[PDB]
Symmetry: C3
Subunit: 258 residues, 3 copies
Amino acid sequence: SKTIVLSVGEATRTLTEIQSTADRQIFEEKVGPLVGRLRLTASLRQNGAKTAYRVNLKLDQADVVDCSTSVCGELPKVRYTQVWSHDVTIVANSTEASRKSLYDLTKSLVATSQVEDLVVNLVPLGRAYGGSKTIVLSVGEATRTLTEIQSTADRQIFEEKVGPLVGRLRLTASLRQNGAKTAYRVNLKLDQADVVDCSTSVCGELPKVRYTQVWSHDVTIVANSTEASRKSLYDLTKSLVATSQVEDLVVNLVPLGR
Amino acid sequence: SKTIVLSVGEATRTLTEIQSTADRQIFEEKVGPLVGRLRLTASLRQNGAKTAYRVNLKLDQADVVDCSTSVCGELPKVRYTQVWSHDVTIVANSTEASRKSLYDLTKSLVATSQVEDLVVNLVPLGRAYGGSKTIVLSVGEATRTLTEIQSTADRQIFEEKVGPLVGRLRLTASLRQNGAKTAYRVNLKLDQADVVDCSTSVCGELPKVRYTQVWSHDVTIVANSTEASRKSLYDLTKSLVATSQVEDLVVNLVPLGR
Amino acid sequence: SKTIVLSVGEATRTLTEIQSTADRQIFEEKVGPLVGRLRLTASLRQNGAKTAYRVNLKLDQADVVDCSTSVCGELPKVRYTQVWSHDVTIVANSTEASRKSLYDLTKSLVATSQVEDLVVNLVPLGRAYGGSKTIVLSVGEATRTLTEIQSTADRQIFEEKVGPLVGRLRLTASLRQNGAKTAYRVNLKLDQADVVDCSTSVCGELPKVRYTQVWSHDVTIVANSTEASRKSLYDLTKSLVATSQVEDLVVNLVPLGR
């Protein structure tokens, strides 16, 4: 049918489509047992007065185990599930260079070594290399350095420092553990506001923001995980954003599946 | 009349006196339009039972724009104002080296590259160069390194670590935004307590503080500013503290203007 | 009688026993005046249903001053007292390598240069050397690096990052000042949980913790101390943990004094 190919190096994991509703669009891998497989619940909406879209991905990953060899008479069974959701907000009258920049920053956010250690080894964000706690988001040769402005007990807010003060980049990380200390909750969020000024056109006009576009994340990690269970969940989501189909889902609003 | 010269390099900006009351003393620049100019409302008091003075400067700066060329029939007008207040507290029975050291620390506080980025690019204080978040306040060849002891969501307290524990240098920076997110509020404050020990004179006497002398700051920065509007406000205040008249205003209590 | 030898370099300070109850065991140094001397109040218990022990050391130190040659007719007298308690919790069914590793980490916790500046110069913990704020607890050639996970206004929690997420090292430092700003209170605490994985024996078994063994600290430092008064209290406690008698008090529960 319609497939997405997630290259995790030389191993390619092909998800095939099992559902096509008007908005929801469920993919699933077909290799292995039937009880625990990959899942990709894509979506698209336009809520309100037709002015803002809402992309919504959700990459589940179940850790199935089958030990009928050891104990006689059992079947394969799912231990836990670890998800990595996305919540993109795109306003309808945007510039295509603003939708491309929001994709290129989040593709480089996931591909850095500070978000990798945040979901694998639970290390918080920011490494001080001669100065403040900074994150570097390379968009090729252009590097956009975000310095930390606030670190309370829950939140950890990063922000770029160049340009005007009214519209700047953001990175609101946090980390929780809800329930009986059994599952964590990583929560990244990158705000990009588009600022414009026309003081060469209209006198007395200071810069102001016209719209904002977000890209949230919501990672769920159970506490007694395997390390290669969290490492493979990161490597699939890093390879999901790097595809050419999630690029067109954000830039041109084309649904997934080729 | 009576002038102060604030050299910002080779460009010298001379403010002339427009008011002289018993305590208040207003200066103003005379070059340019008549609606928005520099302002410097110096003051001096002795509150309470005549034991402590209170120096109080306030360097205003308005950004005037005139575009009668663009739209026909308008007059010059100011958009915003950005101030940099001071609040020096001097106790009357001080040592002359106590008042000189308080001036020599604040003259080197404003002249550093960390307070410059705090008002221009809104970067918080302290850069960790192999260790803790530190600020170096050199007074020539003597460098006084203040290490950060507490970073709350509102305050950011620095303190020196060499010497006794009863009296040490302090630096409680802050950053707010009051109202509808339109104006910031930077707030530095440097406490210097005079400690003395008499153990070579009287036995069993541990060190203790005599008095404290404060040099606070209160910078008001509007959010939609120009970068050269925030840079020139800092570079005028850096050149104001480095003059010989604000030295004698703190050390010898001579009012401004010669 | 029964002695403990604390080498503070080449000078050895020998404390002799002055009390031996069923649990409490008080030592005291015998040189100098009779009003202020070293004091070491060891103890051992097993509270509850005989499942966990509780070691409790307390190294007092009083600063005695005698200036009868200054003022005619006074006697020696103590100004202040600086203590360093310990509170070790050992569960009875432990492994001997678990009790040895807990002693080897605390012996290396006290011997580092970051805890020395915490009690002498009141500098907080953690120095960022290319990355985040880390503490290195070397056990010889094995180095166990704990990275900071939370810096509240009171607490400062460190944690190791390798291995599973369910049981890791901990270091919750704190710093208070109770009363009329006269005395500080340093409080270190190292948690070590024993985690086991039975996946090679029982299928579908994720790692879990068996027990926890703590080693708290409680340093009391008065604010008007001498520097060599706080330096000698640290250098005695560093020389107390490194002895062979406090090793056997934690590993083999042998009481102090040979």
